[PDB]
Symmetry: D2
Subunit: 198 residues, 4 copies
């Protein structure tokens, strides 16, 4: 059974960048629903599989990817943020960033653009290509998870579904992206990077 | 050149079902952006076509469908709503509804379910199948327009992108759908129906 | 464990409409690989589900839908054909066809159109819509199965992957469609239609 | 007006790797239809654009991407092959291949994998990423063109639609891939690589 992880900080810890109302709805309602629905779908999957019911397994895929993906993405998102966050990363990761994107600023532009470029609901990601052995930016639709659909290792994700910013920034998604950089938890991102550089 | 149509009523005319803040942002910001971006993309399309640049034409498709679709959908949505709205339709349309969906209530359930069922951004629609000569409910992702992608004639659309309801109903999309029935402009929907029954 | 079903007839039982070489390859090779690959994929899925590895379950979806769908579709296809096929259905089924498509001739043309219309690999289908309670035609891409991705109950399917006709008809898919009508097992399609008649 | 390009060689110039029957059908029939169908689609698009008919422009996208992509891909494919092909590239291109894929052998295996991996119709590609400034492998479905749907500049493409190999290799696509390496026109791929070398 999958569970909703506790937020690693207070709901208002990311203010004024992401307000408390958004954080609370985001965690207690949106993420909660993803794990609850995921557990329901996996149980139905368990039943379909035991029966060899291929039709049922296939009909269940949209719900499994959407809900399971929702859980995966938000669980990573919470850890990617921090009240003491902001600034730039250091060492090997910063090395890679400058190497793979020219500079930190060029990286910010590219990730921002990938995030602002999502038409509809989705996510912008900084990931790691284990095969090429380098960093890579990608965008995912709806709740499609980075690794399950692209094979890339998630390092930093930016949720651009409207529920992630609308109450505070309304239609101005670029202001939300500008503000989020101030709360990125580079320690966590670094951790994830070093974890796949092994 | 495409233009942003005036709303056929005051921004607060649909209260308390859809508040004025949402209507104003919805029309003046979201729809505006769709037509502005559409005009930009069509102009680029005009250039690509004159040159026989197939690659450019194809690269331009996502923006054309998204923005052009945004314009089509919202232009219909505004007319599908009315301050004096609500209740049930009459005559031939009501006939079709009962015939094709069992009853009005069964129709409401089905359209609502199609609308609540959209994972991510999208629209729920009551359309008309000219080939089969009957009504049909469908759901469209992001701004994909009903007719251009399904061939069905739009009669009644329900925008379920989060910007269409979040500020007022937050994560509770079912409350938004419950409320919207009170402002449906059945006169307009009837008009559209009789227009394709010719 | 899923198994490759024997054909209801000899490989050259459908000559000259679909030649022996095609039937043998299509069954002994194409279908064979789908069943074996499906079993392998399911096993991996059972393991991923057991560990609660969501990323793995998601990464396996393409293979499950592709191989499971290939198994579902082909199993249906073989029973939809018969050396003594051809002509038209009778009683109930014929009645429904006249009712929903105007006439048997029109229906053939409609299903032929959906089949010829597939860009790339796929399938053309005559299915039953339980909710609306009527026949419906649909086209599915690659091996996406009708019921699992659409909800319609499959009654008659036409495989338009090039491997289904290229050796004999080359690039002229319409010649293949014209020919297949001569071997359709209407007895089986009728059986399938009467089964979901609720 | 787009036109069907002549082949740079005789239909049986690539025997025994890709037989004459395949080359003739592939070029004189498949490519021929894409160019003619593309022109017809473009005309309809110019008309729809002129009227500002957005629904029509959108309904035409599938045909434009499919036929325009078919024209783009095949035009590239013919120049990527040569009776005197085979072996490996030299200088700059080879250098980049060793750099981004480890070795030429590894690169072949990577591109073979992408090509064999396509479920349904499609294409496997070696392209150039202008932003990252390196080679990249990608697979495209049906006739979706590489640059128009991905941004990568096409350098070498491998057609894995069944019509590209079924008459000769039947269901065994890997045998086709092994064979094609013997006719790759590295002179042309090198030319394409040096052209986007900015
Ligand atoms: Mn979210
Ligand atoms: Mn909207
Ligand atoms: Mn087949
Ligand atoms: Mn081809």
């Amino acid at each position: 059974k999958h569970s909703l992880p506790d937020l690693p900080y207070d709901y208002g810890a990311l203010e004024p960048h992401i307000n408390a109302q958004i954080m609370q709805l985001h965690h207690s309602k949106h993420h909660a629903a993803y794990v609850n629905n995921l557990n329901v779908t996996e149980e139905k999957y368990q039943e379909a599989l035991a029966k060899g019911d291929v039709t049922a397994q296939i009909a269940l895929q949209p719900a499994l990817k959407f809900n399971g993906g929702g859980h995966i993405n938000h669980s990573i998102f919470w850890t990617n943020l921090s009240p003491n966050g902001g600034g730039e990363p250091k060492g090997e990761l910063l090395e890679a960033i400058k190497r793979d994107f020219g500079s930190f600023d060029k990286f910010k532009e590219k990730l921002t653009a990938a995030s602002v470029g999502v038409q509809g609901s989705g996510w912008g990601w900084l990931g790691f290509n284990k095969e090429r052995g380098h960093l890579q930016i990608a965008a995912c639709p709806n709740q499609d998870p980075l690794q399950g659909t692209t094979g890339l290792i998630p390092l930093l994700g930016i949720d651009v579904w409207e529920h992630a910013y609308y109450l505070q920034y309304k239609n101005v998604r670029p202001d939300y992206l500008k503000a989020i950089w101030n709360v990125i938890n580079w320690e966590n991102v670094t951790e994830r990077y070093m974890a796949c550089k092994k």
